[PDB]
Amino acid sequence: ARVAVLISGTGSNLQALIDSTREPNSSAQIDIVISNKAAVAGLDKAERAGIPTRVINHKLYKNRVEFDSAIDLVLEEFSIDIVCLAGFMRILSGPFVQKWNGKMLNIHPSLLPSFKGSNAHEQALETGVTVTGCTVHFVAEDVDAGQIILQEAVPVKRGDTVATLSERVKLAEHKIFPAALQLVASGTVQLGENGKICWV
Ligand SMILES: Nc1nc2ccc(CNc3ccc(C(=O)NCCCC(=O)O)cc3)cc2c(=O)[nH]1
Numbered sequence: 001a002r003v004a005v006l007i008s009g010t011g012s013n014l015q016a017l018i019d020s021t022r023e024p025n026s027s028a029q030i031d032i033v034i035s036n037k038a039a040v041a042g043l044d045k046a047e048r049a050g051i052p053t054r055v056i057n058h059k060l061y062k063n064r065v066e067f068d069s070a071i072d073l074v075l076e077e078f079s080i081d082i083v084c085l086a087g088f089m090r091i092l093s094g095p096f097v098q099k100w101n102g103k104m105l106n107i108h109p110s111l112l113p114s115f116k117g118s119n120a121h122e123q124a125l126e127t128g129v130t131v132t133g134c135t136v137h138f139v140a141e142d143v144d145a146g147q148i149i150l151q152e153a154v155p156v157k158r159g160d161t162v163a164t165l166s167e168r169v170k171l172a173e174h175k176i177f178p179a180a181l182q183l184v185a186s187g188t189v190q191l192g193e194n195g196k197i198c199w200v
């Protein structure tokens with residue numbers, strides 16, 4: 001399966017996916033890395049891995065529903081089968097989410113029905129949970145609500161801050177995102193027909 005990874009920053013999850021898809025038994029290959037920003041460290045990791053890089057900005061064209069079209073163009077260009085959102089700070093439009101339905105994955109820093117949004121760790125800490133974690137799910141039109149593929153629990157320590165908690169959770173993200181990509185790329189897991197995850 002041909003894969004496109006979309007980023008916005010450092011790209012620690014991108015690197016994990018790079019290392020994983022480089023293994024001999026990987027059913028996925030990363031063919032293109034797209035960023036909505038330009039001075040992101042994620043691009044260097046991509047280039048350092050010999051992966052074509054391509055950046056798309058907003059101040060460079062029109063509104064949104066068109067921004068996704070520019071992305072989708074490069075997607076068709078590289079004959080992509082699966083899309084991985086790795087820290088992409090940009091909500092995709094209904095048409096795009098519709099086209100890649102069941103073919104786009106996202107990694108979220110919480111045990112998903114809980115703490116949807118871009119500040120999951122602050123929410124977790126504010127709420128006082130002693131257990132949080134991360135989730136890999138299929139991207140649906142409604143933010144952080146698509147079908148769940150894998151999840152991993154991570155403890156919250158007393159005195160934790162966004163900095164220390166995110167560091168602990170990232171270790172789990174680097175494990176399940178690559179594993180989840182392999183499950184989908186190999187055909188072991190698919191969105192199914194009844195909308196729910198299916199394990200062939
Ligand atoms: N339709 C669909 N598209 C998505 C696009 C990105 C992400 C990544 N998780 C994200 C979820 C939310 C944001 C967010 O609210 N950003 C700041 C405001 C900018 C904006 O309004 O976009 C960013 C990434 C998940 C989804 C998803 O579940 N469904």
Ligand SMILES: N[C@@H]1O[C@H](COP(=O)(O)O)[C@@H](O)[C@H]1O
Nearest residue numbers: 010011012013086087107109
């Ligand atoms: N995808 C979301 O974005 C954060 C930054 O990831 P990375 O781009 O450094 O890998 C991740 O920890 C995750 O919650």
